[PDB]
Amino acid sequence: VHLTPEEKSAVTALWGKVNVDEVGGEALGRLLVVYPWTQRFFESFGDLSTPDAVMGNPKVKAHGKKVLGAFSDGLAHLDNLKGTFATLSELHCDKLHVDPENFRLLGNVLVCVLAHHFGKEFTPPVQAAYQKVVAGVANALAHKYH
Amino acid sequence: VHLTPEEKSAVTALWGKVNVDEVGGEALGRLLVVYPWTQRFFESFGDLSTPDAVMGNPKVKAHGKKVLGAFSDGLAHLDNLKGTFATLSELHCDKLHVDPENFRLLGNVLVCVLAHHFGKEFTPPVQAAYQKVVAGVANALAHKYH
Amino acid sequence: VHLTPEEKSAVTALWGKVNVDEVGGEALGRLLVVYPWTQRFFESFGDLSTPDAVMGNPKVKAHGKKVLGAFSDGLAHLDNLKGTFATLSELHCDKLHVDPENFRLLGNVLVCVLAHHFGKEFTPPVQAAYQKVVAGVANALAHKYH
Amino acid sequence: VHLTPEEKSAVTALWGKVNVDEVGGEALGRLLVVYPWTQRFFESFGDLSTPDAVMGNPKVKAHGKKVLGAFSDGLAHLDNLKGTFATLSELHCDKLHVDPENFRLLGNVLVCVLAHHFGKEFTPPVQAAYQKVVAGVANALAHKYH
Ligand code: HEM
Numbered sequence: 001v002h003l004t005p006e007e008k009s010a011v012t013a014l015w016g017k018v019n020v021d022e023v024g025g026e027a028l029g030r031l032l033v034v035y036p037w038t039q040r041f042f043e044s045f046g047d048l049s050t051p052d053a054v055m056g057n058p059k060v061k062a063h064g065k066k067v068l069g070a071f072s073d074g075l076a077h078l079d080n081l082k083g084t085f086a087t088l089s090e091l092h093c094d095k096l097h098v099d100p101e102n103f104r105l106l107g108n109v110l111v112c113v114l115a116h117h118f119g120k121e122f123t124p125p126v127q128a129a130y131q132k133v134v135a136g137v138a139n140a141l142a143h144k145y146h
Numbered sequence: 147v148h149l150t151p152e153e154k155s156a157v158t159a160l161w162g163k164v165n166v167d168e169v170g171g172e173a174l175g176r177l178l179v180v181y182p183w184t185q186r187f188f189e190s191f192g193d194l195s196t197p198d199a200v201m202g203n204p205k206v207k208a209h210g211k212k213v214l215g216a217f218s219d220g221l222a223h224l225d226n227l228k229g230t231f232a233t234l235s236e237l238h239c240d241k242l243h244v245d246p247e248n249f250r251l252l253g254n255v256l257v258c259v260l261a262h263h264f265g266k267e268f269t270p271p272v273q274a275a276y277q278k279v280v281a282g283v284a285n286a287l288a289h290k291y292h
Numbered sequence: 293v294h295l296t297p298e299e300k301s302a303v304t305a306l307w308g309k310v311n312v313d314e315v316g317g318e319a320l321g322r323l324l325v326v327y328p329w330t331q332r333f334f335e336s337f338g339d340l341s342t343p344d345a346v347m348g349n350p351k352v353k354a355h356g357k358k359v360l361g362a363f364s365d366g367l368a369h370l371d372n373l374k375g376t377f378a379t380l381s382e383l384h385c386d387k388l389h390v391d392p393e394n395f396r397l398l399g400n401v402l403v404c405v406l407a408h409h410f411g412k413e414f415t416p417p418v419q420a421a422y423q424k425v426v427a428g429v430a431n432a433l434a435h436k437y438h
Numbered sequence: 439v440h441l442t443p444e445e446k447s448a449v450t451a452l453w454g455k456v457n458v459d460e461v462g463g464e465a466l467g468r469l470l471v472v473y474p475w476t477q478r479f480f481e482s483f484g485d486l487s488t489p490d491a492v493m494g495n496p497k498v499k500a501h502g503k504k505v506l507g508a509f510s511d512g513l514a515h516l517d518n519l520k521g522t523f524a525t526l527s528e529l530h531c532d533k534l535h536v537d538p539e540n541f542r543l544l545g546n547v548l549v550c551v552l553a554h555h556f557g558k559e560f561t562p563p564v565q566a567a568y569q570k571v572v573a574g575v576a577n578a579l580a581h582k583y584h
Pocket residue numbers: 038041042066067068070071088092096098102103106107137141
C-alpha cells in the first residue's frame with residue numbers, strides 16, 4: 001500500500017467512526033450469506049443454514065470482531081503489513097488453508113459494508129483508497145503462499 | 147440466474163426505488179476512479195485524470211445512464227439474459243474487446259452503489275440476490291467470448 | 293461453449309490420444325501441489341504433506357480418474373454442459389462447498405498437463421478450443437451458485 | 439517470492455536452457471489467440487485477426503522476445519521483483535493501462551509454454567516454483583495500481 005497523505009488522512013478519519021464490534025460481525029456474516037462456499041471454514045460454528053442463522057450467530061459475531069481488530073492494526077501499520085501479519089499469514093496459509101480469493105471477497109464485502117454505513121461520506125476517492133488497503137491486507141495474509 | 151420468488155421480489159421492489167439515471171453515473175464514475183485501467187475504454191470522453199474530472203464528466207454521467215438502462219432490461223428478462231444481451235455482447239466482445247473481468251468489477255461497483263444508497267434496506271439476502279443478478283449479466287455480456 | 297466444427301474436431305482428436313487414467317491423477321495431483329489450499333478438500337484422503345505424498349496418494353490418483361471421467365462425458369455433450377453437470381453441480385455447491393475459483397484452477401492445470409503431454413500438437417487454436425471447454429465445464433459445475 | 443533452495447536451483451537451471459525467441463513469440467501469440475480481448479493493446483501491430491495472422495506476425499514475435507527479455511532480469515533478482523520491475527510497472531499502469539488480470543493471464547500462458555517446451559523436466563514441484571515466480575512478476579508489474 002501507497003496512499004498519499006490525503007488518502008491516508010481520509011482513510012484513518014473514516015475508520016475512527018467505525019464501530020468495529022458491529023462492522024466485524026456484519027462483514028463476516030455478509031461474506032457467509034453472499035458467497036456460501038465460505039461457510040465451509042466455519043462449519044463448527046453451528047447453524048449457518050439461513051441468513052438469520054448466520055447474521056445473529058454468536059460465534060460469527062465474536063469472530064468478526066476479532067478479524068476486524070486485526071484489520072485496524074493493519075491500518076496503523078500500513079508501512080509493514082507483511083511484518084504485522086506475519087503470524088496470521090502462517091496460520092491462514094499453513095494451517096487453515098484459506099484460498100487467497102477468499103481474502104479478496106472479504107475485502108470487497110468490507111467495502112460494501114462501509115458504503116452501507118457511511119453513504120455519502122464514502123466518496124469515490126475514499127472507496128479507491130479503501131480498495132488499495134483491502135488488497136494490501138489480502139496480499140499480506142496470503143504471503144505464505146508466495 | 148436462480149432467484150427464489152422471495153428473492154425475485156426483493157430485487158424488483160428495490161430496483162423500483164432506484165434513480166437509474168443517477169445511480170448509473172455514480173457506478174460508472176466510481177469504476178473509473180477505483181479501477182483506473184478501465185479509463186482506457188473512455189479516453190474520448192474528455193478529462194478523467196482526476197477523480198473530480200471523472201465524477202464531473204457529463205459524458206460519464208450520460209453513458210452510465212445508458213449502462214443502467216440495459217441493466218434495468220436484464221432485470222425484467224431474468225430468464226432470457228443471453229437473448230436480451232445478444233446484441234450488446236457482440237458489440238462488447240467483437241468490437242470493443244472489453245475484458246470479461248471488467249463486467250465483474252462494474253457489477254461489484256454497482257452493488258456498492260446500491261448499498262451506499264439503500265443503507266438499511268440493503269440486507270444480506272438482498273445483497274445475496276443482487277450479487278446473483280450482476281454475475282448473470284456479466285456472464286450474458288461476455289457470452290461472445292465463451 | 294461455442295466451438296467451430298474445426299475446434300470441436302481438434303478437441304476430439306487430441307482427447308482420443310489421452311490416457312484418462314494417467315491424466316486424471318496427474319491433474320488432480322498437480323492441483324494440490326501448485327495451489328496448496330486445495331488440499332483442504334482432501335484431508336480424508338490421507339497424507340498430502342509432500343508433493344510426493346500428493347502425487348503418490350492412491351485416493352488422489354483414484355479421485356483424479358473419476359474427475360476426468362466426468363469430464364470426458366461433458367465432452368460428448370458440449371452442446372449441454374449445464375444439464376450434463378446439473379447433478380454434480382448440486383453436489384459440489386450444495387454439499388461440498390467447492391469455491392467456483394477452484395474449478396478454474398483445475399481447468400488451468402488440465403490445460404498445462406495437455407501442453408506438457410502433447411507438446412507441439414497442442415497448438416494455439418487447440419489451446420484456445422480447450423480453454424473454452426474447461427471454462428464451460430467450470431461454469432457448469434458452479435451453476436448451483438448462480 | 440520464496441523458493442526452497444531446491445525450487446530455486448530447479449528454476450534457474452531450466453531457464454538457462456530456454457530459447458527466448460521461441461518461448462517469447464509463442465507466449466505472446468497464445469495470449470492474443472486464447473484471450474482475444476488482449477488484442478486491443480496491440481492494435482498497432484497489424485493483423486491479429488487469425489491464429490496464423492497472429493503467429494505469423496513478426497511485430498508479435500519481436501515484442502514477445504522483449505517481454506521475455508524483461509522476464510529474464512526478474513529471475514536474476516527474485517529477491518526484489520518489486521524494485522526490478524518498478525519502471526515497467528509505471529509504464530504499464532500509468533501509460534498503457536493494462537488490467538492486472540492480463541498480467542495473470544500471460545503468466546498462465548507462460549507456464550503452459552514451459553510445460554510444452556520441457557515436457558518431462560516440467561515436474562509438479564517445478565511447475566509450483568514457476569507458478570510462484572509468474573505470480574510474483576504479475577504482482578510486481580501491477581504494483582503501481584496499489
Ligand atoms: C481481512 C482478512 C482477515 C483477517 C485480518 C483475519 C484475521 C483473523 C484473526 C485475528 C484470527 C484469530 C487468530 C487467533 O486464533 O487468535 C483469525 C482466525 C481465523 N480466520 Fe481469519 N481473517 C481474515 C480473513 C479470513 C477469511 C477470508 C476466512 C475464510 C473464509 C478466514 C477464516 C478464519 C478461520 C476459520 C479462523 C480460525 C477460527 C477459529 O480459530 O475457530 N479469515 N482470522
